[PDB]
Amino acid sequence: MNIFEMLRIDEGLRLKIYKDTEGYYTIGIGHLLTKSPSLNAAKSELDKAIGRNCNGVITKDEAEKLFNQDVDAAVRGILRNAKLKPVYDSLDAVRRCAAINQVFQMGETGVAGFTNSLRMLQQKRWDEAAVNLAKSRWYNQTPNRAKRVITTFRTGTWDAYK
């Protein structure tokens, strides 16, 4: 397992524009296009991202290209955030994948309310961190995925993704 295999399992792969768990236009491996409810605005964002007029459809190679960019951008973002970098740098490589997964799904603003969980993770109080992470809109709206990510933060293993 690695961050790409993990996110591929959590996000799936679809080559035509679809709406994500929050009802937002997305494509590929969880590439969010826009939070706009207008399909034409999402098509414009897709064309801008791929570099050609896609008519709402892309190829597997294009999906994987956006995925690599999105994972890379997630990591680089974490490193530029003064609240997230120290906790991230304190983690082992497996738990860092859980952190990237979280940010990939909810964005840095989405992780802003996780201050207490973050502190427990930096303290390596793993069971307590896991309990706190589940007291969230994140866990309640996507419990199966959150349970996998939380187990990864709790154990530092890939047991939840086999």
mmCIF file of C-alpha atoms in Angstrom:
data_model
loop_
_atom_site.group_PDB
_atom_site.id
_atom_site.type_symbol
_atom_site.label_atom_id
_atom_site.label_comp_id
_atom_site.label_asym_id
_atom_site.label_seq_id
_atom_site.Cartn_x
_atom_site.Cartn_y
_atom_site.Cartn_z
ATOM 1 C CA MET A 1 0.000 0.000 0.000
ATOM 2 C CA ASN A 2 0.951 3.629 -0.631
ATOM 3 C CA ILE A 3 -0.952 6.950 -0.798
ATOM 4 C CA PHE A 4 -1.966 6.422 -4.443
ATOM 5 C CA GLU A 5 -3.362 2.940 -3.845
ATOM 6 C CA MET A 6 -5.114 4.143 -0.714
ATOM 7 C CA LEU A 7 -6.790 7.126 -2.348
ATOM 8 C CA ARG A 8 -7.654 5.028 -5.408
ATOM 9 C CA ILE A 9 -9.609 2.695 -3.098
ATOM 10 C CA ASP A 10 -11.324 5.580 -1.247
ATOM 11 C CA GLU A 11 -12.156 7.705 -4.312
ATOM 12 C CA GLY A 12 -12.723 5.198 -7.113
ATOM 13 C CA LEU A 13 -12.178 5.991 -10.807
ATOM 14 C CA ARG A 14 -14.849 7.423 -13.098
ATOM 15 C CA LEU A 15 -14.135 8.854 -16.535
ATOM 16 C CA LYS A 16 -17.308 10.954 -16.935
ATOM 17 C CA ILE A 17 -18.321 13.906 -14.763
ATOM 18 C CA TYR A 18 -20.148 12.703 -11.645
ATOM 19 C CA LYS A 19 -21.208 14.250 -8.339
ATOM 20 C CA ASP A 20 -19.181 13.388 -5.240
ATOM 21 C CA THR A 21 -20.526 12.518 -1.773
ATOM 22 C CA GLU A 22 -21.241 16.215 -1.154
ATOM 23 C CA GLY A 23 -23.079 16.635 -4.459
ATOM 24 C CA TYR A 24 -20.176 18.419 -6.216
ATOM 25 C CA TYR A 25 -19.103 17.913 -9.837
ATOM 26 C CA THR A 26 -16.012 15.692 -9.919
ATOM 27 C CA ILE A 27 -14.171 13.414 -12.354
ATOM 28 C CA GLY A 28 -11.387 10.842 -12.389
ATOM 29 C CA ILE A 29 -10.014 9.771 -9.018
ATOM 30 C CA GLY A 30 -11.774 12.299 -6.838
ATOM 31 C CA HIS A 31 -10.753 15.380 -8.797
ATOM 32 C CA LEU A 32 -13.163 18.092 -7.596
ATOM 33 C CA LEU A 33 -14.087 20.345 -10.499
ATOM 34 C CA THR A 34 -16.180 23.006 -8.769
ATOM 35 C CA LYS A 35 -18.720 23.470 -5.996
ATOM 36 C CA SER A 36 -20.924 25.298 -8.537
ATOM 37 C CA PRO A 37 -24.258 23.611 -9.261
ATOM 38 C CA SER A 38 -23.899 24.505 -12.981
ATOM 39 C CA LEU A 39 -22.738 21.589 -15.106
ATOM 40 C CA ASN A 40 -21.410 23.948 -17.759
ATOM 41 C CA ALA A 41 -19.157 25.624 -15.186
ATOM 42 C CA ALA A 42 -17.839 22.176 -14.221
ATOM 43 C CA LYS A 43 -17.218 21.342 -17.900
ATOM 44 C CA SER A 44 -15.249 24.575 -18.233
ATOM 45 C CA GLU A 45 -13.106 23.691 -15.196
ATOM 46 C CA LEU A 46 -12.472 20.225 -16.668
ATOM 47 C CA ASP A 47 -11.344 21.641 -20.014
ATOM 48 C CA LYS A 48 -9.106 24.127 -18.205
ATOM 49 C CA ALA A 49 -7.524 21.336 -16.147
ATOM 50 C CA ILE A 50 -6.940 18.917 -19.047
ATOM 51 C CA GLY A 51 -6.047 21.444 -21.759
ATOM 52 C CA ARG A 52 -8.635 20.433 -24.396
ATOM 53 C CA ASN A 53 -12.402 20.481 -24.924
ATOM 54 C CA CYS A 54 -13.411 17.267 -23.158
ATOM 55 C CA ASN A 55 -17.201 17.406 -23.393
ATOM 56 C CA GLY A 56 -17.293 16.014 -19.829
ATOM 57 C CA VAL A 57 -15.240 12.837 -20.573
ATOM 58 C CA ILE A 58 -11.566 12.000 -20.028
ATOM 59 C CA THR A 59 -9.240 9.041 -20.451
ATOM 60 C CA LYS A 60 -7.696 6.913 -17.736
ATOM 61 C CA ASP A 61 -4.270 8.465 -18.394
ATOM 62 C CA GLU A 62 -5.750 11.946 -18.003
ATOM 63 C CA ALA A 63 -7.457 10.905 -14.767
ATOM 64 C CA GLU A 64 -4.198 9.555 -13.407
ATOM 65 C CA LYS A 65 -2.375 12.747 -14.399
ATOM 66 C CA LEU A 66 -4.842 14.891 -12.446
ATOM 67 C CA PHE A 67 -4.574 12.420 -9.549
ATOM 68 C CA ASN A 68 -0.792 12.775 -9.329
ATOM 69 C CA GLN A 69 -1.136 16.544 -9.430
ATOM 70 C CA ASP A 70 -3.827 16.470 -6.730
ATOM 71 C CA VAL A 71 -1.840 14.226 -4.372
ATOM 72 C CA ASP A 72 1.299 16.336 -4.914
ATOM 73 C CA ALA A 73 -0.644 19.540 -4.284
ATOM 74 C CA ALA A 74 -2.205 18.088 -1.132
ATOM 75 C CA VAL A 75 1.237 17.317 0.345
ATOM 76 C CA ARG A 76 2.765 20.651 -0.669
ATOM 77 C CA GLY A 77 -0.201 22.422 0.864
ATOM 78 C CA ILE A 78 0.180 20.642 4.184
ATOM 79 C CA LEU A 79 3.834 21.682 4.268
ATOM 80 C CA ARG A 80 2.918 25.345 3.727
ATOM 81 C CA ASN A 81 0.344 25.377 6.533
ATOM 82 C CA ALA A 82 1.874 26.387 9.880
ATOM 83 C CA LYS A 83 -0.781 24.460 11.831
ATOM 84 C CA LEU A 84 -0.441 21.257 9.829
ATOM 85 C CA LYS A 85 3.262 20.958 8.996
ATOM 86 C CA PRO A 86 4.535 20.267 12.520
ATOM 87 C CA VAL A 87 2.022 17.507 13.125
ATOM 88 C CA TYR A 88 2.630 16.014 9.688
ATOM 89 C CA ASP A 89 6.391 16.079 10.170
ATOM 90 C CA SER A 90 5.970 14.381 13.543
ATOM 91 C CA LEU A 91 4.276 11.348 11.943
ATOM 92 C CA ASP A 92 5.690 8.126 10.485
ATOM 93 C CA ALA A 93 5.158 7.533 6.721
ATOM 94 C CA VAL A 94 2.000 5.398 7.062
ATOM 95 C CA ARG A 95 0.212 7.918 9.268
ATOM 96 C CA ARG A 96 1.350 10.706 6.897
ATOM 97 C CA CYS A 97 -0.703 8.925 4.219
ATOM 98 C CA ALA A 98 -3.759 9.199 6.460
ATOM 99 C CA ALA A 99 -3.106 12.938 6.771
ATOM 100 C CA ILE A 100 -2.813 13.367 2.991
ATOM 101 C CA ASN A 101 -6.023 11.362 2.526
ATOM 102 C CA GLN A 102 -7.906 13.655 4.944
ATOM 103 C CA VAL A 103 -6.711 16.836 3.254
ATOM 104 C CA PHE A 104 -7.391 15.355 -0.227
ATOM 105 C CA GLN A 105 -11.000 14.728 0.841
ATOM 106 C CA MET A 106 -11.913 17.806 2.909
ATOM 107 C CA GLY A 107 -9.277 20.386 1.988
ATOM 108 C CA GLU A 108 -7.134 22.403 4.387
ATOM 109 C CA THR A 109 -10.160 24.411 5.504
ATOM 110 C CA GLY A 110 -11.925 21.131 6.144
ATOM 111 C CA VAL A 111 -9.136 20.135 8.536
ATOM 112 C CA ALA A 112 -9.247 23.503 10.327
ATOM 113 C CA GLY A 113 -11.692 22.248 12.946
ATOM 114 C CA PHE A 114 -9.437 19.309 13.803
ATOM 115 C CA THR A 115 -7.120 21.226 16.137
ATOM 116 C CA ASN A 116 -7.660 18.932 19.132
ATOM 117 C CA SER A 117 -7.220 15.747 17.064
ATOM 118 C CA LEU A 118 -4.057 17.223 15.579
ATOM 119 C CA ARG A 119 -2.619 17.893 19.024
ATOM 120 C CA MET A 120 -3.348 14.317 20.137
ATOM 121 C CA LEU A 121 -1.717 12.976 16.952
ATOM 122 C CA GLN A 122 1.444 15.058 17.558
ATOM 123 C CA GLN A 123 1.447 13.729 21.149
ATOM 124 C CA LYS A 124 1.140 10.183 19.716
ATOM 125 C CA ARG A 125 -1.881 9.532 21.925
ATOM 126 C CA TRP A 126 -3.262 7.272 19.226
ATOM 127 C CA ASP A 127 -6.410 5.818 20.794
ATOM 128 C CA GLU A 128 -7.485 9.204 22.110
ATOM 129 C CA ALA A 129 -6.762 10.813 18.734
ATOM 130 C CA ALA A 130 -8.893 8.151 17.040
ATOM 131 C CA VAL A 131 -11.803 8.752 19.405
ATOM 132 C CA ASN A 132 -11.602 12.520 18.810
ATOM 133 C CA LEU A 133 -11.352 12.219 15.026
ATOM 134 C CA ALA A 134 -14.692 10.387 14.928
ATOM 135 C CA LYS A 135 -16.536 13.221 16.709
ATOM 136 C CA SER A 136 -16.896 15.047 13.436
ATOM 137 C CA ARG A 137 -19.127 15.859 10.504
ATOM 138 C CA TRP A 138 -16.468 14.013 8.448
ATOM 139 C CA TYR A 139 -17.043 10.703 10.237
ATOM 140 C CA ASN A 140 -20.815 11.047 10.300
ATOM 141 C CA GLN A 141 -21.146 11.832 6.562
ATOM 142 C CA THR A 142 -18.537 9.287 5.291
ATOM 143 C CA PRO A 143 -18.214 6.724 8.100
ATOM 144 C CA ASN A 144 -16.821 3.805 6.193
ATOM 145 C CA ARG A 145 -14.011 5.847 4.690
ATOM 146 C CA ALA A 146 -13.374 7.793 7.879
ATOM 147 C CA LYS A 147 -13.151 4.527 9.812
ATOM 148 C CA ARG A 148 -10.402 3.336 7.431
ATOM 149 C CA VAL A 149 -8.464 6.584 7.690
ATOM 150 C CA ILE A 150 -8.854 6.709 11.480
ATOM 151 C CA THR A 151 -7.655 3.101 11.827
ATOM 152 C CA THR A 152 -4.581 4.112 9.807
ATOM 153 C CA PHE A 153 -3.931 7.056 12.186
ATOM 154 C CA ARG A 154 -4.531 4.811 15.211
ATOM 155 C CA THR A 155 -2.244 1.928 14.192
ATOM 156 C CA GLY A 156 0.329 3.173 11.722
ATOM 157 C CA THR A 157 -0.487 0.087 9.637
ATOM 158 C CA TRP A 158 -2.429 -0.574 6.433
ATOM 159 C CA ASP A 159 -4.781 -3.069 8.068
ATOM 160 C CA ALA A 160 -7.889 -1.147 6.982
ATOM 161 C CA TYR A 161 -6.922 -1.325 3.294
ATOM 162 C CA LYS A 162 -5.479 -4.867 3.133
#
